[PDB]
Design a protein around this ligand. Structure first.
Ligand SMILES: *[C@@H]1O[C@H](CO[C@@H]2O[C@@H](C)[C@@H](O)[C@@H](O)[C@@H]2O)[C@@H](O[C@@H]2O[C@H](CO)[C@@H](O[C@@H]3O[C@H](CO[C@H]4O[C@H](CO)[C@@H](O)[C@H](O)[C@@H]4O)[C@@H](O)[C@H](O[C@H]4O[C@H](CO)[C@@H](O)[C@H](O)[C@@H]4O)[C@@H]3O)[C@H](O)[C@H]2NC(C)=O)[C@H](O)[C@H]1NC(C)=O
Ligand SMILES: *[C@@H]1O[C@H](CO)[C@@H](O[C@@H]2O[C@H](CO)[C@@H](O[C@@H]3O[C@H](CO[C@H]4O[C@H](CO)[C@@H](O)[C@H](O)[C@@H]4O)[C@@H](O)[C@H](O[C@H]4O[C@H](CO)[C@@H](O)[C@H](O)[C@@H]4O)[C@@H]3O)[C@H](O)[C@H]2NC(C)=O)[C@H](O)[C@H]1NC(C)=O
Ligand SMILES: *[C@@H]1O[C@H](CO)[C@@H](O[C@@H]2O[C@H](CO)[C@@H](O[C@@H]3O[C@H](CO[C@H]4O[C@H](CO)[C@@H](O)[C@H](O)[C@@H]4O)[C@@H](O)[C@H](O[C@H]4O[C@H](CO)[C@@H](O)[C@H](O)[C@@H]4O)[C@@H]3O)[C@H](O)[C@H]2NC(C)=O)[C@H](O)[C@H]1NC(C)=O
Ligand SMILES: *[C@@H]1O[C@H](CO)[C@@H](O[C@@H]2O[C@H](CO)[C@@H](O[C@@H]3O[C@H](CO)[C@@H](O)[C@H](O)[C@@H]3O)[C@H](O)[C@H]2NC(C)=O)[C@H](O)[C@H]1NC(C)=O
Ligand SMILES: *[C@@H]1O[C@H](CO)[C@@H](O[C@@H]2O[C@H](CO)[C@@H](O[C@@H]3O[C@H](CO)[C@@H](O)[C@H](O)[C@@H]3O)[C@H](O)[C@H]2NC(C)=O)[C@H](O)[C@H]1NC(C)=O
Ligand SMILES: *[C@@H]1O[C@H](CO)[C@@H](O[C@@H]2O[C@H](CO)[C@@H](O)[C@H](O)[C@H]2NC(C)=O)[C@H](O)[C@H]1NC(C)=O
Ligand SMILES: OC[C@H]1O[C@H](O)[C@H](O)[C@@H](O)[C@H]1O
Ligand SMILES: OC[C@H]1O[C@H](O)[C@H](O)[C@@H](O)[C@H]1O
Lengths: 390, 391
């Protein structure tokens, strides 16, 4: 969506994966979804310098709303968990320099069961627009046929621009067309800043593998329509939780960067490993994912439990991934023709490769004939960045 | 096998999972399976105090052997990767105060393709016995019918006892009885210090989950025949590698302890996290697994993505596991009736529970009535130890 927004993969935090739809603010007041929760989080992003690194969007997902519309017929946050109301929440969020995001649903209900938005789009839009929202996650649970769906996404999309408020619009449209018919991504892209493609994501290696395996096996349709204004969105970053091994975490991070994917954490920033936060904030990696160019990466090679990904950057510079899909054993070694890498370009004739992960080391120069070798840990990933001698 | 060995779950290291069958000592010398490597390892176990914690067995798995017998007919380690035959290495192993273990195969070939042992049992036995071996991993790849199999395991078993050398014999027999018939474990137990039951183990969470679930859904047959001399063996400990997250590592360790399982690491003790080594050596946890009693634990409860395991120990003390099988979200909380725990016993009248994992904390006293509540991380595990008293 060309609204001059998301001219770079959006960076922020989303409560979903880490807190799901928790409401028991009795025996569990800290995992409970409340303005108190976010308010805390907001503080932090600023504290441990998350904002400084790039994450600037704090967003609420499903289950933030009270059971039903008000006398006026607009939504309303749960009275008990959000007594002061979004608006005010937003103002704090803004006071702290951040931007707020809210969750909504095109159909008759959110995947949570709460209020939908069907035949309310316009109203709701103005609502948020007035509440002071900056970003909308438009989910699509509950709706007759794509007619109601497609139209709803499209419709709402227009409703917002109309409001005048600059709102990053994040669709989930595609994820729902499957498996009835491949979506017209060129279409969608004219309506979203970024959309979901695959199922949600567990705090697990499996869930991640499938997503890659999926985005791998589909680049034909998606990898292309990617670029400023509109991005392909895998899902939140579960790095900092528990389901992932170390080498599994670098992987997600490394690859989300390769796939110009929106960066949304879903972790408790209050209790997060230092080792984790380090990765999550690596200036050089965020830079790659935040490349101004907006050219989504893709899998180059397959075979021998090895995956080779790469994304062209700006200035003849290229980013490259090396995933060791071998669940057992130890660190294997992979070697490739420096030349037949950056589509032949990057490295002609000179190349400067600096391992940017998992240890940002300074490898030497590489000739077009030079052959590159490196070892990769099981389920891990070695991220490289190449510079051409120009 | 009542040979006065493994009167406690055997503790050691086995190169398999961490190094598999690596032979390229040209372009991959560090992973390469050679006497040089084992010598290093040996040294270390002693260094960072692994020996002190309990691990006392250093074992070689498949791919340690040269292509075929010698003139005499016995077995010979690969000439190049094992220039000093075995014996000598065993002296260095023995020197450090450790015990060595070697891999062999009942059939015509090891799962690697190397020399078998079919119609050589006796010879081989004496061989190892001579070489100064302390433990044998008898694998079972390649063989006609269980006839050849069952007999081979049984046969070899006797061959060793005969040699006179005290050799911990670790079978894989069962893993190979399926798909034919559930194993006369009472039989097997009269021939092994411990045997394999389920497929190999990847450096992955999945591989572990399946083993638990598989074992979970079989206790009827196995959990019972467990005790001194003979143990149920899951597989190596992949803690210290990369496939497991933190919460996932405590789990394996916590549960192997619950399942009086042999403790065999498969990691590079050179490049091993400090945080890892800490767990692997936790005195209180090793103690549980090393319980003198020899009563294998078992899953008590199911449901809601929660698993409750427990093993009775010695002195009216009980060990308890709490696995959060919920792959997504955050740390949930589980609460149970202190009473209906240690089969009703432990916690009558008082129960002193000290979280022994993942943070060994000192919880207070608990009465029979008492209700114990605790939160558990996703894919993680909270290990508890209850002792009986009367304050
Ligand atoms: C390891 O590999 C060994 C080699 O066997 C494989 O197959 C042969 C044909 C080659 O291709 C070889 O390269 C392969 O590796 C394997 O040894 C084999 O073991 C079986 C079981 O003992 C033998 O089969 C039997 O053969 C007899 C004939 O003579 C045997 O018995 C006499 C007296 O007991 C001995 O003096 C001989 O040395 C032989 O051992 C058959 O009588 C019998 O067959 C029955 O059914 C047939 C079918 O109609 C009837 O005709 C017979 O009368 C019987 O009723 C068995 O089939 C086989 O001879 C032997 N091979 C060799 C070369 O000796 C060994 O089993 C493998 N190890 C493991 C653990 O699997
Ligand atoms: C409702 O929908 C309409 C329809 O699109 C929107 O209209 C767009 O409004 C945005 C608002 O700025 C316009 O964006 C501007 O585009 C310029 C065109 O350059 C683009 O392409 C070049 C080359 O590819 C790039 O270098 C450049 O980055 C752009 O991608 C830009 O030059 C403008 O950038 C300027 O502003 C930014 C922000 O301060 C500065 O950082 C830059 O240095 C520069 O000064 C800007 O991005 C867009 O062109 C309009 N398109 C159309 C079709 O009208 C409305 O915005 C929307 N209404 C609401 C409320 O959302
Ligand atoms: C080949 O196979 C034989 C047959 O099993 C092995 O012999 C066994 O060796 C173990 C090793 O100790 C013996 O186990 C010990 O038994 C003691 C009791 O002995 C009585 O009961 C046994 C069992 O029926 C009878 O065989 C025997 O005649 C006795 O009546 C226990 O007291 C031991 O535990 C306690 O004592 C030991 C010994 O001092 C201490 O070390 C312990 O800490 C503990 O205090 C232990 O359980 C077993 O008894 C032997 N059985 C037989 C039939 O001989 C051979 O060792 C084996 N040979 C080779 C080369 O491997
Ligand atoms: C997916 O949706 C996009 C968005 O509409 C479709 O692309 C657009 O398709 C229309 C036709 O329906 C094109 O209109 C044509 O424009 C030319 C001049 O540009 C004119 O000469 C023709 O008479 C006609 O009006 C439109 O240009 C085109 N826009 C873009 C940016 O591609 C696309 O067709 C849809 N995909 C599929 C498979 O249907
Ligand atoms: C598994 O194998 C074991 C032995 O390897 C089998 O157990 C054996 O069972 C017989 C009974 O059928 C026992 O013999 C008994 O001997 C007494 C005298 O002491 C006699 O009075 C009885 O009539 C009987 O014959 C034998 O001791 C016992 N062996 C062992 C080691 O316990 C068992 O049958 C096999 N299990 C299955 C399911 O096949
Ligand atoms: C929400 O549910 C209502 C009621 O089930 C859907 O409305 C029906 O729409 C069909 C056309 O698809 C009409 O023939 C019916 O008369 C409608 N019934 C009512 C009570 O309005 C509505 O379409 C659903 N919304 C979505 C997005 O699927
Ligand atoms: O109901 C809440 C959930 O709804 C969908 O499943 C969505 O894909 C998830 O990310 C989350 O928003
Ligand atoms: O090749 C050696 C391997 O053979 C089998 O697969 C066995 O289960 C493994 O533990 C290992 O010993």
């Amino acid at each position: 969506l060309d609204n001059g927004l998301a001219r770079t993969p959006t960076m922020g935090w989303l409560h979903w994966e880490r807190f799901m739809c928790n409401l028991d603010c009795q025996e569990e007041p800290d995992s409970c979804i409340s303005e108190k929760l976010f308010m805390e989080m907001a503080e932090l992003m600023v504290s441990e310098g998350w904002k400084d690194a790039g994450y600037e969007y704090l967003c609420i997902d499903d289950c933030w709303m009270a059971p039903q519309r008000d006398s006026e017929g607009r939504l309303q946050a749960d009275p008990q968990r959000f007594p002061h109301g979004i608006r005010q929440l937003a103002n704090y969020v803004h006071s702290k320099g951040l931007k707020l995001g809210i969750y909504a649903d095109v159909g008759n209900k959110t995947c949570a069961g709460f209020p939908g938005s069907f035949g309310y789009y316009d109203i709701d839009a103005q609502t948020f627009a007035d509440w002071g929202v900056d970003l909308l996650k438009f989910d699509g649970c509950y709706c007759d046929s794509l007619e109601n769906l497609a139209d709803g996404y499209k419709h709402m999309s227009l409703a917002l621009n109309r409001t005048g408020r600059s709102i990053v619009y994040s669709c989930e449209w595609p994820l729902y067309m499957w498996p009835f018919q491949k979506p017209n991504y060129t279409e969608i892209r004219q309506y979203c800043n970024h959309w979901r493609n695959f199922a949600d994501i567990d705090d697990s290696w499996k869930s991640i593998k499938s997503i890659l395996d999926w985005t791998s096996f589909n680049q034909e349709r998606i990898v292309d329509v990617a670029g400023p204004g509109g991005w392909n969105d895998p899902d939140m970053l579960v790095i900092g939780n528990f389901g992932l091994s170390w080498n599994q975490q670098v992987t997600q991070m490394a690859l989300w960067a390769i796939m110009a994917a929106p960066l949304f954490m879903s972790n408790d920033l209050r209790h997060i490993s230092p080792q984790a936060k380090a990765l999550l904030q690596d200036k050089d990696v965020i830079a790659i994912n935040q490349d101004p160019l907006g050219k989504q990466g893709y899998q180059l090679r397959q075979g021998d439990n090895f995956e080779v990904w790469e994304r062209p950057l700006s200035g003849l510079a290229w980013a490259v991934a090396m995933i060791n899909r071998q669940e057992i054993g130890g660190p294997r070694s992979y070697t490739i023709a420096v030349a037949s890498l950056g589509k032949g370009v990057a490295c002609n004739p000179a190349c400067f490769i600096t391992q940017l992960l998992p240890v940002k080391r300074k490898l030497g120069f590489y000739e077009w004939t030079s052959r590159l070798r490196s070892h990769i840990n099981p389920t891990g990933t070695v991220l490289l960045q190449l510079e051409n001698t120009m």
